[PDB]
Design a protein around this motif. Structure first.
Motif, short mmCIF file in Angstrom:
data_model
loop_
_atom_site.label_atom_id
_atom_site.label_comp_id
_atom_site.label_asym_id
_atom_site.label_seq_id
_atom_site.Cartn_x
_atom_site.Cartn_y
_atom_site.Cartn_z
N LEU A 13 0.82 -1.21 0.00
CA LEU A 13 0.00 0.00 0.00
C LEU A 13 0.85 1.27 0.00
O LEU A 13 0.55 2.22 -0.73
CB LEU A 13 -0.94 0.00 1.21
N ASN A 14 1.90 1.31 0.82
CA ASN A 14 2.77 2.47 0.93
C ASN A 14 4.09 2.00 1.55
O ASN A 14 4.41 0.81 1.53
CB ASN A 14 2.10 3.61 1.72
N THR A 16 4.95 1.79 4.64
CA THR A 16 4.86 1.08 5.91
C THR A 16 3.80 -0.01 5.95
O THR A 16 3.57 -0.58 7.03
CB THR A 16 4.61 2.07 7.06
N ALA A 17 3.13 -0.33 4.84
CA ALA A 17 2.00 -1.24 4.93
C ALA A 17 1.78 -1.99 3.63
O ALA A 17 2.17 -1.54 2.54
CB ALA A 17 0.72 -0.48 5.31
N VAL A 58 -5.01 -5.71 6.35
CA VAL A 58 -3.94 -4.74 6.09
C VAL A 58 -2.90 -4.90 7.19
O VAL A 58 -3.24 -4.86 8.38
CB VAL A 58 -4.48 -3.29 6.06
N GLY A 60 0.25 -3.22 8.83
CA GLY A 60 0.82 -1.90 8.91
C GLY A 60 2.08 -1.82 9.76
O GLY A 60 2.58 -2.81 10.29
N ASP A 61 2.59 -0.60 9.85
CA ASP A 61 3.75 -0.26 10.68
C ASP A 61 4.98 -1.09 10.30
O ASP A 61 5.70 -1.61 11.15
CB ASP A 61 3.41 -0.41 12.16
N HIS A 180 0.15 10.83 0.80
CA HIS A 180 1.28 10.40 1.61
C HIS A 180 1.56 11.30 2.82
O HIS A 180 2.48 11.00 3.58
CB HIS A 180 2.54 10.29 0.75
C1 LIG Z 1 0.19 3.73 5.01
O1 LIG Z 1 -0.79 2.71 5.14
C2 LIG Z 1 -1.29 2.51 6.48
C3 LIG Z 1 -2.32 1.41 6.38
O2 LIG Z 1 -3.35 1.75 5.46
C4 LIG Z 1 -1.83 3.81 7.08
O3 LIG Z 1 -2.14 3.62 8.46
C5 LIG Z 1 -3.56 3.71 8.70
O4 LIG Z 1 -4.05 5.05 8.78
C6 LIG Z 1 -5.47 5.12 9.00
C7 LIG Z 1 -5.86 6.58 8.90
O5 LIG Z 1 -5.15 7.37 9.85
C8 LIG Z 1 -5.82 4.50 10.34
O6 LIG Z 1 -7.23 4.54 10.56
C9 LIG Z 1 -7.51 5.16 11.82
O7 LIG Z 1 -7.45 4.26 12.93
C10 LIG Z 1 -7.95 4.73 14.23
C11 LIG Z 1 -9.17 3.87 14.65
O8 LIG Z 1 -8.85 2.49 14.49
C12 LIG Z 1 -8.17 6.29 14.27
O9 LIG Z 1 -6.90 6.95 14.41
C13 LIG Z 1 -8.99 6.81 13.02
O10 LIG Z 1 -10.36 7.04 13.35
C14 LIG Z 1 -8.83 5.93 11.76
O11 LIG Z 1 -9.95 5.04 11.70
C15 LIG Z 1 -5.32 3.06 10.39
O12 LIG Z 1 -5.52 2.51 11.68
C16 LIG Z 1 -3.84 2.98 10.02
N1 LIG Z 1 -3.42 1.59 9.92
C17 LIG Z 1 -2.26 1.13 10.41
C18 LIG Z 1 -1.38 2.14 11.10
O13 LIG Z 1 -1.93 -0.04 10.30
C19 LIG Z 1 -0.84 4.96 6.91
O14 LIG Z 1 -1.44 6.18 7.32
C20 LIG Z 1 -0.40 5.05 5.46
N2 LIG Z 1 0.51 6.17 5.25
C21 LIG Z 1 1.77 6.25 5.70
C22 LIG Z 1 2.51 7.50 5.33
O15 LIG Z 1 2.28 5.37 6.38
#
Ligand SMILES: *[C@@H]1O[C@H](CO)[C@@H](O[C@@H]2O[C@H](CO)[C@@H](O[C@@H]3O[C@H](CO)[C@@H](O)[C@H](O)[C@@H]3O)[C@H](O)[C@H]2NC(C)=O)[C@H](O)[C@H]1NC(C)=O
Length: 197
Positions: A13-14, A16-17, A58, A60-61, A180
């Motif tokens: 996806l990017n 980190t994920a 998905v 992530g991290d 991004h």
């Molecule tokens: C790279 O891709 C990952 C995975 O798609 C991105 O991380 C994800 O970002 C979204 C949006 O911020 C997160 O959703 C949020 O989660 C919580 C509730 O669970 C809350 O902060 C918000 O209400 C929203 O629903 C998602 O959890 C997160 N997933 C991960 C970290 O695994 C990331 O932003 C993308 N971009 C970069 C530059 O890494």
């Protein structure tokens, strides 16, 4: 006893994920209760594992520009099922998930005791994805130690900011966003004072 999951599909996806998608194993003996996803950095190494109820996920991290080995196994009432053949996937290179360059230093023109006009241009690069909107911060150099955000998104390259304090010095800065993330701040605008009330 049940066979490994079928039709596995993964894509980075990017930086980190990555996301993983699969189909139910064929001819299951008992109802599938869930799946277990195993992944490790890339000769196998001890892997991280995630348990989920659905047919897609998905992960992530993760580290940028790094290859991962992924496998899936289904668990049912008769124990853990057979483990799928390993699949490999590489997170995006860092140069490929770049946020835009900082927009150019904004131009500022006083409008009233409580209003200011402001305009900016984008930077030399949009990054790895086109700019989606701009954000604007302001600060009073005489008293404030930090920038204040204006909680709106602008598709225009100019705006008028209202509600400022009269007879006060101000500076303004702009950031551009893509999928991004945020750019660095633009250079601060030159100091400008609102008219006195
Ligand atoms: C790279 O891709 C990952 C995975 O798609 C991105 O991380 C994800 O970002 C979204 C949006 O911020 C997160 O959703 C949020 O989660 C919580 C509730 O669970 C809350 O902060 C918000 O209400 C929203 O629903 C998602 O959890 C997160 N997933 C991960 C970290 O695994 C990331 O932003 C993308 N971009 C970069 C530059 O890494």
């Amino acid at each position: 006893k049940v066979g490994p999951p079928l039709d596995i599909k993964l894509g980075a996806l990017n930086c980190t994920a990555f996301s993983i998608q699969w189909k139910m194993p064929r001819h299951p003996g008992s109802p599938i209760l869930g799946y277990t996803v195993f992944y490790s950095e890339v000769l196998h190494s001890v892997p991280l594992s995630r348990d989920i109820p659905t047919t897609e996920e998905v992960i992530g991290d993760l580290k940028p520009g790094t290859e991962y080995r992924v496998s899936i196994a289904a668990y049912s009432q008769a124990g853990k099922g057979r483990l799928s053949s390993p699949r490999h996937v590489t997170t995006l290179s860092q140069d490929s998930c770049l946020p835009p360059a900082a927009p150019q230093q904004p131009h500022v023109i006083v409008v009233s005791d409580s209003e200011v006009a402001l305009s900016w241009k984008p930077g030399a690069s949009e990054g790895s994805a086109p700019i989606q909107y701009y954000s604007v911060e302001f600060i009073r150099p005489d008293f404030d130690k930090k920038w204040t955000s204006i909680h709106e998104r602008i598709q225009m390259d100019s705006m008028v900011i209202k509600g400022l304090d009269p007879d006060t010095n101000y500076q303004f800065a702009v950031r551009a966003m893509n999928s991004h993330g945020p750019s660095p701040r633009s250079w601060p605008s030159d100091i400008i004072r609102t008219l006195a009330a």
